[PDB]
Amino acid sequence: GFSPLMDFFHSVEGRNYGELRSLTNETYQISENVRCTFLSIQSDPFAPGSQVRLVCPCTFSLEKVLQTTDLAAANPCRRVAAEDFILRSFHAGYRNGIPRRTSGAVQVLRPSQHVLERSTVGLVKAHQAEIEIFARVKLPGHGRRIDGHGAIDIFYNELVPLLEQCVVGLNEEDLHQHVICVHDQEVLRSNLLGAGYVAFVANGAILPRDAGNSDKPLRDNAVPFQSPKSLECSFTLPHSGKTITGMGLPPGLTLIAGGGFHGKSTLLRALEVGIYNHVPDDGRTYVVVDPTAVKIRAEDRRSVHGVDISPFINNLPFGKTTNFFVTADASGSTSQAANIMEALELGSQLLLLDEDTCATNLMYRDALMQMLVPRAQEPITPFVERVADLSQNHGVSSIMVIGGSGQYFPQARVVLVMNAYQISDCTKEAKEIASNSSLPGDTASVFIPDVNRCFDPDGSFTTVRRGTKVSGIGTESIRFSEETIDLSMVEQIVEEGQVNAIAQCLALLYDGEPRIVPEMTTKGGALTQLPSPGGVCEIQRGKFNSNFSSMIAGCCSHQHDKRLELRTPSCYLPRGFTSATRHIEIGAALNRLRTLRTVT
Amino acid sequence: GFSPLMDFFHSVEGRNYGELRSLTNETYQISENVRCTFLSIQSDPFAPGSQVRLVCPCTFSLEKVLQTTDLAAANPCRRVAAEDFILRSFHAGYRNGIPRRTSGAVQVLRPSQHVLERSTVGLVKAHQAEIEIFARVKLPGHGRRIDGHGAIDIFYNELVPLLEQCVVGLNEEDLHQHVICVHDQEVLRSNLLGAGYVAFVANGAILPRDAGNSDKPLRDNAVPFQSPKSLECSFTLPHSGKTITGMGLPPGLTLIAGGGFHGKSTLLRALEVGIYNHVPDDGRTYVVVDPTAVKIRAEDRRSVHGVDISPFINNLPFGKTTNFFVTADASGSTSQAANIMEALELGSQLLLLDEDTCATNLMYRDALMQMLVPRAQEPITPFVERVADLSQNHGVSSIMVIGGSGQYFPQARVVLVMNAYQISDCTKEAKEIASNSSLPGDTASVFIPDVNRCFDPDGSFTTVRRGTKVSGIGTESIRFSEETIDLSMVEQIVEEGQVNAIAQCLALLYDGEPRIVPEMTTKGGALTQLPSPGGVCEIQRGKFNSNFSSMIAGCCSHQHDKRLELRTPSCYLPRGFTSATRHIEIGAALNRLRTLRTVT
Ligand SMILES: Nc1ncnc2c1ncn2[C@@H]1O[C@H](COP(=O)(O)OP(=O)(O)O)[C@@H](O)[C@H]1O
Ligand SMILES: Nc1ncnc2c1ncn2[C@@H]1O[C@H](COP(=O)(O)OP(=O)(O)O)[C@@H](O)[C@H]1O
Ligand SMILES: [Mg+2]
Ligand SMILES: [Mg+2]
Ligand SMILES: [Mg+2]
């Protein structure tokens, strides 16, 4: 009894392509363990693929893998990891030539090295559990006639063997080990703060990435990571029962110095993605940071609206103000200042900076220049004069790659040096250098944690009313009607599915606007915890808050409640192409909308 | 006898849109002083507009305006300026509501503030001179039927009144003054080097730009430019007979310091566009620099192929080399080093740098850091240790906006300080600061003027053979088949017509490839002069040369000989949408092609 779908396609062979519409909302049993529901049908063969939901039984033990017999009680971190393993096993089927033929007609979201919650694969209650996988399938045509034999080949000779062999026939022991490792990664990260660290870098980690675009670990001539002994510490990982050792970094300022190309940025990049759990053989596994960490850099030409950058830029010429700063075209230093103050507003407790991509004028200032141009005639206060304030008064740590100056040596708690990819702790040497040279707080903090900033939907969106489609373009941008929001320098976005999540939230605001703003604001404001990209709901620290950030957190939480598919009118996406992202990245995107208007 | 075109459109009213093809290559006299030739006809009403050539008599005195009675003998600088004035007068007609109705169907290239040679408007021999203007016109349809009345309205009630009133009826005295001023700008710039300067900034200049996208001068609260007396000098402008006074900058290193937002970058931006003549009321008029000046900045993530960056980055770990450097993903410092060495190869004798957009690690290094990480373990040599070499041994000057360090004070010839938009010469103060502090050449130059670098068309293009359309996207990029060449940080591109010129040259190489490489190389190598963007053919200085740059100069020269319309197979453009660009920007684009391959 698996032939009805084939019998259908045989019946419409050669007929007008429009007649495919009759598949809409029908479900077919196409093999013993595979059902397929058509969620939508392409209007013609050149349109984007028809969306389907494919369903298989869950054949592994829930008790062994998820530690419960009841699916609804399962730890979301383990459920997410299991969905991520199934997704990888599906794609591995293609790589290993499991389909009898590969049509090129099937599109399923391809995961990065990171283990994110995604709408692609769901472990759900059976219609005991089943597995749903969402895909788009280009139903072939000859001109405007249906290629029924071509369609039959896709379903019966491609999707069926893949799902039967790679999903129904998945290796349960590999699945279990994947899920243990991910759960231990998440428990390790969540133990950092309590143990007195902002970051941990496992011994044996392979940090550099291979050549090109795979983001896979460098396969040859890689120097495994080895902690300086002065910083080495050990964590027990309860799910695998293992003990891991590596470099712990304490709160305060850590500097990473060393020659260009000696491994500094590679270490820092592993830290930036340390907010995500990784596939087990990734190399950066158990390299973790505070989940609110934000990569800060210069970003000249971006727009800014209503951000208080007065801690870094103040006293402009001609009474111009920076307490509610607005620009359509930021410089290096003003973009970086705005990036910092926006990250603080969205709650980041750890700033990660790389001198190679910061604005010099915000990083450094030497004594010679101050004699020529006195501080009172220089609007810009460098980060070195604010970094201790952030840390001591607001508990915000900083990790900074540096190479050009020793001006941070006195402020630093730890100074690392990378040389030929080997790391040393050189804190004592640096302090001696600073003390033997000619370098230079119950003082009111310049940082105001109660930020006064509210989204103005009317002013933000009105320009654009003059369908209203919001869509994600790769990982690089969002088209918002005729506007383009450039995300290419929001560096902790790792999957195009996350840009789709962002687009949905921005459209939600557009489609909901008057009442949705206060509602999301109230909802986000009442939250004590937010979902991480790994599906786990963590406690929110830090005193920084604002209506704008609470509103963003409410959107993000609401998208999580809707399983990453908001289905709002102005953002139409095929189902199963969205990946979880922090409310931080959703706010980063709205901050960059060129028509943005905010108000006090 | 002007009704035949109307009679045609009346005859095809309501007929199939395909029948418009019969207009191809026909010419119509649509008023006493206006002819219109259809160069191509849209295949349907949704296609890009049909291209037309519109021709009017030249009614001003050639002798008065161009100083000759024979068009072919006219100075190209004056001919270009006259074409640019006609183009502006045409667009001004729209602004002033001259057409009886504005259909929105007519597209003619819109000039920037700069006076470039363009294929849009030509002063040509009469079929005594006439004026050609190239346009695209969307011939309206109702569904797939011809709207003949709509077309008649465009030609007879829009283009005819515009051309009759604004081109045939142009103000000859305004035209003359435009042409005098432009010619004086060009003569001023070409006199710089001989007089001992690399830049001149006229007194009375208004440098800041108004809010937003117009690039017009700031209309309110602008502080006119006033030279420090120590640098003030005077030039006589022979065409107007006037004498202009302003700040002359001598060869060597000039620093521009002062607080953020006190006017430094605004001065530097006026210098970067000082390679172009400007419309007379622009504000930056008579602000000129060496015509080979290049804006240098950091540009992380660009690709580089076969560039010797060894003067800045050398002695990497593990015998990696930088004498023929290759990367798919440059850092801040490596992109900036490559930008510098590529500009030198293409012949630039003046580097313009803004600290706010440079890579810190290439700009600066202090003594404290050198004690922690000795110079021998640091691949990166900062620009401050190479800037005197460039200047003394190769005659390459530098003008740099700085704010973070006094480390360049000893090397500088001139130190300017901007405060509240007022400028001072503070060279003496800076030198005293450096001498009273603790700061630190028949030495072999590290810079090799005989660059060894050849374009490899086979390796560069082969990937992309797997129509081959090359096109310009605004001023931001070129689509080269499925490749995208990002030009958004090639900052002296000022018109989308220039990106079209670039695209034509790149397609020329693609379409011509084996034999075209040696031919262009030989042609560019033999040139003693190249055409400027203003249409004037200047003498090429400096010893830097390579096969790659000669090849680029040959392409640029050949495009100039073809009046900015190459008509190569892989780059199809409507006629009249191209603007002159230096061979420097054409090479900048090819340098950034991600499949680029070069060879020694
Ligand atoms: N542990 C390692 N083993 C092998 N190669 C490495 C390692 N760490 C970094 N690299 C490689 O060295 C090169 C330069 O590294 P990077 O950290 O960019 O240096 P920096 O940021 O100090 O300029 C990169 O191509 C990187 O992949
Ligand atoms: N001569 C002037 N008159 C009026 N405004 C000016 C002048 N020069 C610059 N400005 C304005 O001051 C602001 C900051 O100028 P900018 O040169 O960017 O400073 P910096 O590069 O020193 O940070 C800009 O908006 C600019 O338009
Ligand atoms: Mg680096
Ligand atoms: Mg960009
Ligand atoms: Mg600036």
Numbering used by the authors:
A (entry chain A), B (entry chain A): 50 to 176, 183 to 495, 501 to 526, 532 to 665
Wording from the paper:
One such protein, MRB1590, was originally identified in MRB1 complexes immunoprecipitated or tandem affinity purified with GAP1/GAP2 (21). In vivo experiments suggest that MRB1590 effects editing of several mitochondrial mRNA transcripts, in particular that encoding subunit 6 of ATPase synthase (A6). Structural studies showed that MRB1590 contains an ABC-like ATPase domain, which is embedded between N- and C-terminal domains that harbor novel folds. We show that residues in the basic N-terminal domain are involved in RNA binding and crystal structures capturing open and closed states of MRB1590 suggest possible mechanisms for how this protein may participate in RNA editing processes.
To try and gain insight into the molecular basis for the MRB1590–ADP interaction with RNA, we obtained a structure of MRB1590-ADP in the presence of poly-U15 RNA to 2.05 Å resolution. Clear density for ADP was revealed in the structure, however, only weak electron density for the RNA was found near the MRB1590 N-domains. This likely reflects the fact that MRB1590 binds nonspecifically and with low affinity to this RNA. Specifically, while the initial MRB1590–ADP and MRB1590–AMP–PNP structures largely adopt the same conformation (rmsd = 0.7 Å for 1158 corresponding Cα atoms), superimpositions of these structures with the MRB1590 structure solved in the presence of RNA showed that the latter structure has undergone a large shift in its oligomeric interface. This distinct dimer conformation appears to be the result of rotations originating at the nucleotide binding dimer interface. The MRB1590 structure solved with RNA buries less surface area (2127 Å2) than the other structures, due to its fewer cross dimer contacts. The notable consequence of the structural changes found in the MRB1590 structure obtained in the presence of RNA is that the attached N-domains are significantly rotated relative to the rest of the protein. As a result the central cleft or pore located between the N-domains adopts an ‘open’ state. The average distance between N-domains in the RNA bound or open conformation is ∼28 Å compared to ∼3 Å in the closed state. By contrast, in the RNA bound structure there are no cross N-domain interactions and the pore is open.
